[PDB]
Design a protein around this ligand. Sequence first.
Ligand SMILES: Nc1nc(CCc2ccc3cc[nH]c3c2)cc(=O)[nH]1
Ligand SMILES: Nc1nc(CCc2ccc3cc[nH]c3c2)cc(=O)[nH]1
Lengths: 377, 377
Amino acid sequence: FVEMVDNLRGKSGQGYYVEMTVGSPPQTLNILVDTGSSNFAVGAAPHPFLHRYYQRQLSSTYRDLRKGVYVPYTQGKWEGELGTDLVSIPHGPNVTVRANIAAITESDKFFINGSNWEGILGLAYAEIARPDDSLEPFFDSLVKQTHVPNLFSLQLCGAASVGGSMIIGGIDHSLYTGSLWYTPIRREWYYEVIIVRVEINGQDLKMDCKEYNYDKSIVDSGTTNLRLPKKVFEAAVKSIKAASSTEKFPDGFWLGEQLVCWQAGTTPWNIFPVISLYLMGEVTNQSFRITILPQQYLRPVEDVATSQDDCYKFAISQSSTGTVMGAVIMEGFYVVFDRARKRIGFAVSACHVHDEFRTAAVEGPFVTLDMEDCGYN
Amino acid sequence: FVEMVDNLRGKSGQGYYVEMTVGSPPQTLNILVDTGSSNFAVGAAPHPFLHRYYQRQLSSTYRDLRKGVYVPYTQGKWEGELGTDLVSIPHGPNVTVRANIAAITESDKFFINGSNWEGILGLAYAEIARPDDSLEPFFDSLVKQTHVPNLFSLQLCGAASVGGSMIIGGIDHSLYTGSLWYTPIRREWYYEVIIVRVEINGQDLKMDCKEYNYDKSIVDSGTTNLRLPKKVFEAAVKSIKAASSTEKFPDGFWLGEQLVCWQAGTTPWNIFPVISLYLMGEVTNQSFRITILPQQYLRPVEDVATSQDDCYKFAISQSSTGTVMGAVIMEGFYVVFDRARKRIGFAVSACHVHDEFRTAAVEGPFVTLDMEDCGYN
Ligand SMILES: Nc1nc(CCc2ccc3cc[nH]c3c2)cc(=O)[nH]1
Ligand SMILES: Nc1nc(CCc2ccc3cc[nH]c3c2)cc(=O)[nH]1
């Protein structure tokens, strides 16, 4: 799988993309790797922010499905025209395949001005695949049409300009140290999992188990932040705040309403806590824990148009769709989406940003009771 | 105040704007009326989506304040350069004034491609005025520098193309029928108020009082939706769902993940509930209630690029910053922001969209105990 190592590029806060080709003859496009949705979509008209776009007129193998698709957000959106053509992945496995494709033809706040990607790859499951679950996701199609094993893994590094590896087909043991630990995929819609216990530094939020996964905890290459629900963000942030009382910072800052700054080589790593999420483990009453440094949740804002100092942003933030384990968490770890086995594995990333003191860990086993009672229904 | 009647234009879901002039000689710009923030900001560089922009080079009366300003969102943002020049409002009161102005010089997902506004007018209070409360908001400046009375009112109509009236200086009794009822402004930061009871159709959500204002209920001309917190959105939506069991609709729809449709002249108003929020009243244990129809929370998506039927959207949605009473609620009513008296008044809007059956109401007085215990602290 060295072929596939280092095959993801991207820029800070704009997401990770992989090169794919679509249609015969092949039209290359950078597509954004997204474990939080289940549609394969490309810009198909000359939107001014796109470097490239799907020109269906140049592909012999295109096939309209005479149907629309209207994916809204809060408040982005995109809409398009379902077709099917032959997709391939240059720095991936050596299979071409025929998958569905939404040709994006109108959109709001979807494309990012100054990014180098022209489309999304939704690697989650049919159940959330708009317009409805009849729309067979790419990865279901890739597996169903080849010998390629039903899994993929992701090592998102991020150094400005970011990089990583999407190993389609298996695991590459050069991307991680220590051992992989597995939390089961609770249901095949998003990559939904269950945090059974949350510590900041060691002392946990003694919160009711259910509040960590209200109404959902998911793993998302497509979200930037670690996103906690309101009740829990409230809780975590207070313990983070108390933790962090070598100093004071503005109120808004925490709610992602300002940046905070120090000078080159002059930031306090160690005044800030390590965080640890315990995820449900493979066995009854067994769990394990993954631990992030503040390098992961304090991420620099690169080009700030009125600032020369180190102005990092706070990467943890609130929600109502649930916990979203974004690049903040995922950049700590080699993450394996074992779809074959309804489970996600976490190991210490061979490229995560560690200092001389602390470090990211994946550690187990621990004993946790009533892990199943931390779902919501 | 007829001078000021009908002085707001806008387009569906894109917001309400009023014409202002900035600098000498005066440069006209459409600015977006926003009760949810406290900064006056104009695009000052040729962003491709702007019709117009502040050219400080043409104004004698400009004055740099040699300071930046970096307003992020989730995940829009803008940043700019604080100055001060002479603002006026053509279809407003006949005063020119010297207020602060952030010249917006970089931004992300802030301006709307295809809108006709080039700036924001933040009519809330200094406390939330970025970069900090020393930045005197326009309206504080307008009052402090003229005889203009410390209040304004808003009648947002929305019919496509929307319209309304911002009466700066007082109230115009032609804009409402019945009587005005006043909920007090709890703190002068946002226009924060307190919902003491919530019904759908009549039967309330029997929810703990605090969950309606966790952590905030505000009144926002700048938000489109009625936005409830997660716990309460969960609650309301279930009662809305049960209410609405003459029919079934997709799961996503409710979470603003799809549109829903019927044919021209063929939509079920009456299968859907009226909603009623009870707001804290002026006297101890006294409250009143405002009531919206489904015309207010079911708002048409205008030009849909793969649809000919009536496809309305669901205007109620979740949050973690709190309740946000947006154009959904505000379009029902003539809303008076009596800043002089730390209070907001609600009357039946002379332009709200009512059918022959039901109608929007403002009704009181009711008896409600422990209204003060519905805050959060
Ligand atoms: N997992 C996702 N996918 C999306 C759509 C793709 C997208 C759009 C913008 C950005 C910015 C950074 N990553 C992005 C991904 C939205 C979302 O809410 N969750
Ligand atoms: N009250 C506000 N003001 C803003 C900024 C202005 C704005 C931007 C986009 C739209 C779309 C519809 N109305 C808008 C207002 C953001 C926000 O979250 N709350």
